[PDB]
Write a protein that binds this ligand. Structure first.
Ligand SMILES: c1cncc(Cn2cccc2)c1
Ligand SMILES: [Zn+2]
Ligand SMILES: [Zn+2]
Length: 583
């Protein structure tokens, strides 16, 4: 308790010694409270005018227009201790899983060099603004690194002074850039060296672009077994137990020397003991602590969520298959049965899953899995929008399964080749492309963000009539040589390029498609297929509406409207690519 977190608390106390007051009307129940101090400050969602001017029919669709307008009661909940049988199942499975992930990988420290490069190419690290302005300025100043070094030698000493979270079904915990470095130096190898790639982890998808996920689900569907289960957890990050954090820390058993000590300190001092500062409107700053739940960098959060989700789903599979009888207690021969199951079929059972942090798809050996709920509920991983003990609804067709906010279509090209494409309701896609975040956007920067969305649509959603037309319109309206932009884990985004989108389509869906037999490149957009016209409406297309009718016929007008506002620039017409405009 206060021996590990006291120093951090002590230090913040003295920076606001004029204000420190143990408030009596504090709202926290499951968070330990410590004191309050005086502050006074808060980042709303702004409209992208280039995208909105070129999507006029959606100006009257509330599911689009409402997205641009406008639970911290769940972070203040408690998760009961799992039973002894459950704690033993998790320890055996975690020990086995780290071993498997480590067979072809070597834990290693990430470097100042590596960290610096990441700051200079814009990444969502979750730092704050204070002595230096941006991350860019702190990383070039030698002062920073002496603060980093002092903390670093404190961690080797088993102590912490400045690794403090700043709070803001979401909750992002910003830290200062120095604490973010020490986290990256010790644990960044999990992401930098792709420990959760599908090649390495068999269940994972790390590095897989949206164009691979449908093919991966179709491959899981080819396995013999029961329904495909895709159960969402209610507030995954809030249900991470201290038992989970101890199984995650076992990655340090694979480390040596300095690295081992630095990683042990990240887990013990900052993950298994947190200090947080929260804005209350009643405006004070509350200094609160707790031992459990997930509050780490976003990228480490993704890899450890993937790990613990892989562990939980193997255990739910063991329960369905009758490997153990009760979570109350594992007998000695049940332990050896669990171990022997892992050794004999663990890798096969990982390959029946697609896991992206808290998001999973599982094709179990049979449907006993649907009612195998005791371990899942006792680990705290309670399913969303179903009653605790109600059996899971499975999906009979891989093309209906939700994963990473998408579903996937099987689409046959006029030449017989098969595409498996990503899809979601088109209102969600259009509504998201019409939104910017942050201040000080020039017209050029707004246009280049519009162009990023357009190129994404050409590569991923070319099969949606409205998006291919709107993408061609935005690319026609933005100067041809202007570079697509975005402010700041992600798989590589191949739409982020000034390369000819048609040449990218050919390499992504044909040349470098490990699922595609024939490597013959496509020599015209008009060869590339759409979904069915009825399947497009189902997925939220405005095809058929008079609003969409004129918008299409008269798009050249909207394209030229935008061209005039950006100004005298080289513009290309990509609409003639459309069969409708193509004579
Ligand atoms: C994070 C890191 N690597 C892959 C994913 C999966 N994914 C791809 C597109 C949308 C989701 C997520
Ligand atoms: Zn620290
Ligand atoms: Zn669809």
């Amino acid at each position: 308790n206060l021996d590990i977190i006291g120093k951090r608390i002590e230090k913040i106390k003295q920076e606001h010694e004029t204000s420190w007051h143990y408030d009596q009307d504090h709202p926290y129940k499951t968070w330990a409270y410590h004191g309050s101090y005086e502050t006074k400050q808060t980042a709303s969602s702004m409209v992208n005018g280039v995208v909105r001017l070129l999507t006029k029919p959606w100006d009257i669709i509330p599911m689009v227009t409402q997205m641009a307008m406008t639970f911290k009661e769940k972070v203040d909940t408690r998760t009961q201790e799992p039973k002894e049988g459950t704690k033993k199942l998790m320890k055996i499975t975690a020990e086995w899983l780290w071993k498997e992930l480590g067979k072809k990988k070597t834990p290693r420290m990430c470097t100042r060099e590596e960290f610096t490069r990441k700051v200079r190419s814009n990444a969502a690290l979750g730092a704050i603004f204070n002595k230096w302005k941006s991350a860019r300025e702190a990383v070039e100043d030698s002062g920073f690194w002496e603060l980093v070094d002092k903390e670093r030698n404190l961690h080797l000493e088993g102590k912490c002074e400045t690794c403090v979270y700043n709070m803001m079904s979401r909750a992002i915990w910003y830290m200062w850039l120095g604490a973010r470095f020490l986290e990256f130096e010790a644990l960044g190898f999990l992401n930098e060296d792709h420990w959760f790639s599908r090649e390495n982890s068999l269940s994972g998808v790390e590095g897989e672009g949206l164009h691979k996920l449908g093919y991966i689900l179709r491959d899981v569907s080819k396995k013999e077994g029961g329904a495909m289960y895709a159960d969402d957890t209610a507030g995954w990050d809030t249900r991470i137990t201290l038992e989970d954090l101890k199984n995650e820390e076992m990655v340090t058993n694979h480390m040596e020397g300095e690295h081992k000590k630095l990683a042990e300190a990240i887990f013990k001092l900052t993950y298994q003991n947190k200090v947080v500062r929260v804005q209350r409107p009643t405006t004070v700053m509350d200094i609160i602590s707790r031992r459990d739940q997930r509050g780490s960098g976003q990228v480490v959060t993704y890899g450890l969520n993937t790990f613990t989700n892989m562990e939980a789903q193997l255990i739910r599979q063991m329960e369905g298959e009758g490997v153990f009888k009760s979570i109350q207690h594992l007998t000695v021969t049940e332990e050896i049965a669990v171990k022997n199951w892992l050794v004999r079929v663990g890798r096969e059972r990982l390959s029946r899953m697609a896991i992206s942090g808290d998001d999973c798809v599982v094709k179990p050996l049979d449907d006993r899995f649907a009612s195998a709920l005791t371990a899942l509920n006792d680990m705290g991983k309670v399913r969303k929008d179903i009653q605790q003990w109600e059996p899971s609804r499975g999906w009979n067709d891989w093309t209906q399964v939700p994963f990473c906010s998408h579903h996937f279509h099987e689409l046959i090209m006029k030449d017989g080749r098969v595409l498996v494409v990503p899809c979601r309701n088109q209102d969600e896609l259009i509504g998201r492309a019409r939104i910017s975040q942050g201040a000080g956007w020039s017209l050029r920067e707004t246009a280049c963000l519009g162009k990023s969305y357009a190129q994404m649509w050409s590569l991923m959603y070319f099969h949606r009539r409205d998006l291919r037309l709107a993408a061609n319109a935005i690319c026609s309206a933005v100067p041809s040589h202007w570079v697509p932009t975005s402010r700041t884990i992600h798989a590589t985004h191949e739409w982020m390029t000034t390369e000819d989108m048609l040449t990218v389509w050919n390499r992504v869906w044909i040349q470098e498609n490990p699922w595609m037999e024939d490597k013959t490149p496509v020599e015209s957009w008009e060869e590339i297929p759409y979904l069915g016209k009825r399947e497009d409406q189902w997925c939220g297309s405005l095809i058929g509406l008079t609003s969409r009718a004129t918008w299409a016929k008269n798009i050249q007008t909207a394209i030229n409207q935008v061209r005039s506002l950006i100004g005298n620039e080289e513009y290309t017409d990509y609409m003639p690519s459309m069969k409708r405009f193509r004579r």
